[PDB]
Write a protein that binds this ligand. Structure first.
Ligand SMILES: O=C(O)CN(c1cccc(-n2ncc(C(=O)O)c2[C@H]2C[C@@H]2c2ccccc2)c1)S(=O)(=O)c1ccccc1
Length: 290
């Protein structure tokens, strides 16, 4: 369990960013690591087998917007990125989840297309294959895995921001709606902690949110927990040692550098560090130090 860092990849501030930076909760330090080969915002991060994966996004620059179908793999042992097989389609504002060593890429946008499609990556074969699409088209969708079930939460379908959520049952290759959230949330941070799916922040169609709610998969209810100190949409999120960390985002005024940490035992958020610069739309995951 020792020696793990919180990695933040990519993001946006004025343009899409290539940064890979890693935070050590044990000593408060930050390390700047190998840049992404292509800057990307609106991507997601995940880890399989100790390797960090950066999935999807878009490269916004002064000279273009290119939605990304890319899957790139970072090895902390070498501090190097390698390309992996690309997805079937570009997916900006993506969500991802891992089940049993396989990466699920969910939703996202390609130009004005809002995807319901979902695809699954097999690292052993370096192949993607499509699975059943969601019941709803969702961009800015929060994704998490609990008990080997995949959840897609909130987002934007092209017309409305969403409070709805749905669950994917892999052995049936089927999606089913779950109880909707109490709040419409697009671009929220979604993660799993203990037996609950948390949805932190986001945009409700009117304001960036500091509220946080959690879905208990046994009772099928959403309950609010303590709100974050900062309103934020397009935040990064991960779980480490029993606590939720939220990174950056947009509060309606500033691209935040704040990192807050949620303790479920006390139901409190604390501000624990700042990123080296404010940014939104990052991918975040946890793996060993490089
Ligand atoms: O991809 C990008 O359009 C910028 N990014 C992004 C990445 C992930 C999620 C999001 N998101 N969250 C909440 C919402 C929301 O409107 O409901 C969105 C964007 C996707 C939704 C959208 C809706 C209608 C028209 C256009 C877009 C944004 S960003 O570059 O990180 C950034 C964030 C905040 C301010 C500036 C830039």
């Amino acid at each position: 369990k020792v020696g793990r860092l919180i990695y933040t990849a990519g993001g946006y501030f004025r343009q899409s960013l290539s940064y890979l930076e890693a935070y050590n909760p044990s000593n408060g330090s930050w390390l700047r690591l190998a840049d992404l080969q292509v800057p990307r915002s609106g991507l997601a991060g995940c880890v399989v087998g100790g390797l960090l994966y950066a999935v999807g996004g878009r490269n916004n620059s002064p000279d273009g917007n290119t939605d990304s179908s890319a899957l790139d793999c970072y090895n902390p042992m070498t501090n190097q990125w390698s390309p992996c097989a690309s997805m079937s389609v570009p997916r900006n504002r993506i969500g991802v989840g891992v089940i049993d060593g396989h990466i699920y890429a969910v939703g996202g946008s390609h130009g004005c297309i809002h995807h319901s499609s979902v695809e699954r990556y097999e690292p052993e074969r370096d192949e993607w294959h499509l699975v059943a699409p969601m019941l709803t088209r969702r961009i800015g969708v929060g994704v998490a895995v609990l008990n080997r079930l995949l959840y897609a939460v909130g987002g934007f379908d092209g017309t409305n921001r969403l409070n709805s959520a749905e669950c994917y049952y892999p052995e049936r290759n089927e999606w089913r709606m779950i109880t909707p959230m109490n709040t419409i949330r697009s671009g929220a941070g979604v993660c799993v902690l203990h037996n609950c799916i948390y949805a932190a922040g986001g945009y409700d169609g009117q304001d960036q949110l500091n509220s946080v709610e959690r879905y208990d998969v046994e009772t099928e209810t959403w309950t609010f927990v303590a709100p974050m100190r900062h309103h934020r949409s397009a935040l990064g999120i991960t779980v480490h040692q029993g606590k939720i960390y939220v990174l950056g985002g947009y509060d309606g005024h500033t691209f935040l550098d704040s990192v807050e940490c949620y303790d479920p035992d006390s139901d409190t958020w604390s501000e624990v560090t700042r990123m080296t610069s404010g940014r939104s739309g990052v991918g975040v995951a946890v793996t060993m130090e490089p």
